Amino acid sequence: GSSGSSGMERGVDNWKVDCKCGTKDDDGERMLACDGCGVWHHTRCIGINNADALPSKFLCFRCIELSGPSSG
Ligand SMILES: [Zn+2]
Ligand SMILES: [Zn+2]
Numbered sequence: 404g405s406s407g408s409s410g411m412e413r414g415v416d417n418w419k420v421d422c423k424c425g426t427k428d429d430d431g432e433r434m435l436a437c438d439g440c441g442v443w444h445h446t447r448c449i450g451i452n453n454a455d456a457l458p459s460k461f462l463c464f465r466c467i468e469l470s471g472p473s474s475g
Pocket of ligand 2: 437438439440441442462463464465466
């Protein structure tokens with residue numbers, strides 16, 4: 404998967420707004436929180452337009468592996 408170069412708990416309020424583009428706050432394009440973790444993403448980047456409705460649940464790439472019996 405992708406890798407990280409930097410990051411820290413400081414900047415955007417609770418609502419986690421992150422995307423490949425590089426947005427940290429509501430720019431203007433509709434977004435949706437990942438039912439899995441709870442991160443707002445660009446409904447467009449993910450591949451969705453206002454035209455169609457929103458998916459009951461949307462999981463991110465990080466969740467794909469996050470989801471598990473892993474107690475720790
Ligand atoms: Zn984006
Ligand atoms: Zn997620």
